[PDB]
Swiss-Prot record, chain A:
Part of the 30S ribosomal subunit. It comes from Escherichia coli (strain K12). This is Small ribosomal subunit protein uS17. Keywords: Antibiotic resistance, Ribonucleoprotein, Ribosomal protein, RNA-binding, rRNA-binding. The gene is rpsQ. Pfam families: Ribosomal_S17. Belongs to the universal ribosomal protein uS17 family.
Swiss-Prot record, chain B:
The keyword Cytoplasm does not apply. Gene3D superfamilies: Ribosomal Protein S4 Delta 41, Chain A, domain 1, RNA-binding S4 domain. This is Small ribosomal subunit protein uS4. It comes from the Bacteria. It comes from Escherichia coli (strain K12). The gene is rpsD. GO terms for molecular function: mRNA 5'-UTR binding; mRNA regulatory element binding translation repressor activity; rRNA binding; structural constituent of ribosome.
Curated annotation (Swiss-Prot), chain C:
It comes from Escherichia coli (strain K12). Transmembrane segments: none annotated. NCBIfam families: S16. The gene is rpsP. One of its GO terms (cellular component) is small ribosomal subunit. This is Small ribosomal subunit protein bS16. It comes from the Bacteria.
Swiss-Prot record, chain D:
Keywords: Ribonucleoprotein, Ribosomal protein, RNA-binding, rRNA-binding. Belongs to the bacterial ribosomal protein bS20 family. This is Small ribosomal subunit protein bS20. Pfam families: Ribosomal_S20p (PF01649). Part of the 30S ribosomal subunit. Residues 1-25 are annotated as: Disordered. It comes from Escherichia coli (strain K12). GO terms for biological process: cytoplasmic translation; ribosomal small subunit assembly. Binds directly to 16S ribosomal RNA. Coiled coil: none annotated.
RNA sequence: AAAUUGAAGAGUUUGAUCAUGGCUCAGAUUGAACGCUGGCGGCAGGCCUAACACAUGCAAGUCGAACGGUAACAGGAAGAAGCUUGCUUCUUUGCUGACGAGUGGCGGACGGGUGAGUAAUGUCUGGGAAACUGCCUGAUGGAGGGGGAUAACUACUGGAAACGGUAGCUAAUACCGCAUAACGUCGCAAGACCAAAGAGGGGGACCUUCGGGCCUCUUGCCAUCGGAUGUGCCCAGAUGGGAUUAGCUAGUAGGUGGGGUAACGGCUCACCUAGGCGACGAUCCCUAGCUGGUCUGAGAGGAUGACCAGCCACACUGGAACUGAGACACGGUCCAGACUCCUACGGGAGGCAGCAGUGGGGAAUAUUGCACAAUGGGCGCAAGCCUGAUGCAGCCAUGCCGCGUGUAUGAAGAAGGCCUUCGGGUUGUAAAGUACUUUCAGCGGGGAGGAAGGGAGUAAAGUUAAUACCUUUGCUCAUUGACGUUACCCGCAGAAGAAGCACCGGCUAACUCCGGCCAGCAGCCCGGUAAUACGGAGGGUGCAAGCGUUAAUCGGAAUUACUGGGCGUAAAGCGCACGCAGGCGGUUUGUUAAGUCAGAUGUGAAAUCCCCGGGCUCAACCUGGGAACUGCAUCUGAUACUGG
């Protein structure tokens, strides 16, 4: 019921944090073609639960560091 | 902001009577109407499309005595209004105050009608209106002021108008020197020798 | 504070005031919160020159908004006429 | 300054600066006492210094020198640091 | 009911043709400039360049109902009179109306200016949480009792000045404890802790130590929780160019803990981990305030960001903090620098990118004006004071709009001018003459509206113990306008004071005469001795208080082609292939609902654009309502197609 996002984890080398890439399908404003656009977010991953490739559901929260403002909700698909 | 020079020159250039004179004579007895003005008036060169459009626009303008800025604004408003642009333009041209005063019979020419209007001798609904371009609306009552009813100009103009045709949208009483603007004239009520589409094509190019 | 006042629009020598609810620090014709009416001081008495909503005005006064003296006189005359 | 109000404001501002500086130095000293008692590991001295620091901190927060949030921060930090010893 | 009803081509490559292709033109528009000319008014606009330097005047004050006070002027005053005894003229008194300086409160962070910096530390759209918020406002309470000072002042004294120093005295709603203390703060809890200020109006008696305490009303004070407003912070998307800039980054990315902020946070520090950004353009370089909007366009787009409104940044240059609810502060503070000025040479002072204005730069942009009368703002109980905001006025044809420079008659068609086949034609009803008129300008007389309020009186109601005081509500009286000699109206006189600019070879409306590839014209394609192209004249054409030229944007240009182009020979298929990223992908079923579609909600500021009306005598202009804002987010569904 809370507004959230969904993307795949592209990096988990940092501790308690992951980098999730939110891919979106946007129509080109001029030529009308539907192009892919990637939004990479630094997400807070406590317990280090997410590996590379997991399709995770994230939500926005207060700033947790210089670049982290999103936190993890749950993992949908797990790197396989 | 006014044309003060020769009058019959305009009608000679347009090849058509523009009613720029009162009507005590025929224009044929005052000038060579069938001959264009100037040293090279005997020649008649083949007019281009732009030439014909410009000449029709100038004929309408010189008929109504309207300069180019006001006529351009008239066309702009006519193209803005709904319906056919040409009859809108001619209705906007006929709605003027000096035009109505001339058509009412208080002016021998539209120049002396404009002088009557501008000199604060014409009333609209009891209010002295001295703007020649004043748009007269239906049901308006146009009358000579008490002070100007004594002028022989209005008498001669009344007589000269009685010897003219009567417009269908004007109910005038020569005794009271007053008239009523009943309605805007339809396309079929004005002159049939005026091609509004020429002006529309000239201003839309 | 929040105040209900007039913003002098219109032309030269022919003012037309818009009764606006605005933060009292902004300029006269500047940023306002809500327009709650108008006031034409040179109306011909043939038409209307006082169409200020009293519902939202009372709602804002209930929230501590201040009423300027001219707007107070306008509210008084609107209540008397209606 | 060119305006009279600006000159009086400068005078008042420096006077208030000196007053506030004295008050702030007093409060900082009374907080440094608690911090030094924390460093020494003396819990009795730590609680004594905290009991001496709390009233003047609340008073300076009430007199407008510091915000109530800053007083609460100081109290909570020093309480959590005292509770880490005994 | 209405509020997308909208799309033009032409000249020029050739002996000629079709195509390709560039150049030029016809249209709008401007913060415009220059040349010729120039009557009036309304509405707007007016340093685009040197964010170059500034003379001078003003642009932020206010409160005696916080306080000690009395220096100034107005009064009351006790006492001494010049003496022309009813003018009383000076000796002392804060007694009061007030008020210079001073302490104190609030305001100087608003309002006003500029666009230097800023390519994202900003702006726009849409969301969010970890926050503060003076004045305004709702609720609940408290408001007790003390102290030490200090400005002013006094005395001395240092300085040219700016400005100080020492000693003594005094007040407060200035300052500081004490008491009090909860739905406030810390803490799981027990408990611990934290505030305040008076003033004014009037008064029935009781009690007065003659100041008054005592009652009532207003206002102010402190604490907490809310509202409103403002602000701080975070995320996503969008918001110029360059790859002849491909690697960048050490507080760098994250974590634990300490600190710090109103608040989250590498915001800061210690330690640890070794990451993070980047081909969806990181880094670097150049340019640039952003938006609503403006111009153009049928539209999609292109250009642009002056005025008006929102946001941001800046305040001589660089840095920094203080006070404060709010600033790291245009007309505050400290420091350093450049510059300018005063000086007694020891020291000082200043910051027009506020309103006028000056010098300079430039093709170019105005008055060193009036008033707070209206709106708004600051302070005040109020009266009121301040307000270069603002309302107006001055200058400029800079633009838009409106009006005038007369009207009617007037011929054998006068004169002169020009042409002429020498017949005449044209200028041309044009002029002269005659009759009439007086808008605007000139002189004189009336005259709205912008004016709401505020003041003094009474009367009613509320409050109260009170028929005082105060608040609200009626009515009465005398007033409040910079504009201003207003708009508008009335009278007078007389056509009297008022037409110019460009063009005439084609594109492009408009043709003849006269003076050698020269003089010259030219936006693109004339002049070598009868040039509609040069220059002059006559005539005509187009605009008209303007007309042209230049500069600039879009259109035409389908000439960067998304809508909407091409590549055999006109410019264009890599010499050929393999292939990563990327783009696309046969067919069936199920599932999801990401793209897609439908509905609803929130938002999309006002102005502007458009539609129907209204008011200015019309218009410009102002304005009511609507439509629009083609967008974004959320929620609920659809499952055909694309995707998983």
């Amino acid at each position: 019921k809370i507004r959230t996002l969904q993307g795949r984890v592209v990096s988990d080398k940092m501790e308690k944090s992951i980098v999730v890439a939110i891919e979106r399908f946007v129509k080109h404003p001029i030529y009308g073609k539907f192009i892919k656009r990637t939004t990479k977010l630094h997400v807070h991953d406590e317990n280090n639960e997410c590996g590379i490739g997991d399709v995770v559901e994230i939500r926005e929260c207060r700033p947790l560091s210089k670049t982290k403002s999103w936190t993890l909700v749950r993992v949908v698909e797990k790197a396989v | 902001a006014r044309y003060l020079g020769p009058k019959l020159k305009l009608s000679r250039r347009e090849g058509t009577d523009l009613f720029l004179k009162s009507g005590v004579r025929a224009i044929d007895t005052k000038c060579k109407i069938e001959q264009a003005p100037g040293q090279h008036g005997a020649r008649k060169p083949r007019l281009s499309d732009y030439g014909v459009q410009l000449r029709e626009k100038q004929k309408v303008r010189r008929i109504y005595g309207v300069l180019e800025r006001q006529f351009r604004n008239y066309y702009k408003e006519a193209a803005r209004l709904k319906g056919n642009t040409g009859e809108n333009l001619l209705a906007l041209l006929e709605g003027r105050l000096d035009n109505v005063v001339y058509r009412m019979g208080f002016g021998a020419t539209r120049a002396e009608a404009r002088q009557l209007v501008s000199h604060k001798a014409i009333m609209v609904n009891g209010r002295v209106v001295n703007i020649a371009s004043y748009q007269v609306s239906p049901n308006d009552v146009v009358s000579i002021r008490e002070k100007a009813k004594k002028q022989s100009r209005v008498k001669a103009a009344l007589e000269l108008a009685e010897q003219r045709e009567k417009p269908t949208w004007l109910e005038v009483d020569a005794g009271k020197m007053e008239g009523t603007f009943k309605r805007k004239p339809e396309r079929s009520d004005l002159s049939a020798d005026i091609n509004e589409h020429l002006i529309v094509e000239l201003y839309s190019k | 504070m929040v105040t209900i006042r007039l913003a002098r629009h219109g032309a030269k020598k022919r003012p037309f005031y818009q009764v606006v609810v605005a933060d009292s620090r902004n300029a006269r014709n500047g940023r306002f919160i809500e327009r709650v009416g108008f006031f034409n001081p040179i109306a011909s008495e043939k038409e209307e020159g006082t169409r200020l909503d009293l519902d939202r005005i009372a709602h804002w006064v209930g929230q501590g908004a201040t009423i300027s003296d001219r707007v107070a006189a306008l509210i008084k005359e609107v209540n008397k006429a209606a | 300054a060119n305006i009279k109000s600006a000159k009086k404001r400068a005078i008042q501002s420096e006077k208030a600066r000196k007053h506030n500086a004295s008050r702030r130095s007093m409060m900082r000293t009374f907080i440094k006492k608690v911090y030094a008692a924390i460093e020494a590991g003396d819990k009795a001295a730590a609680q004594k210094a905290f009991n001496e620091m709390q009233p003047i901190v609340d008073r300076q927060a009430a007199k407008g020198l510091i915000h109530k949030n800053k007083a609460a921060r100081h109290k909570a930090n020093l309480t959590a640091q005292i509770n880490k010893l005994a």
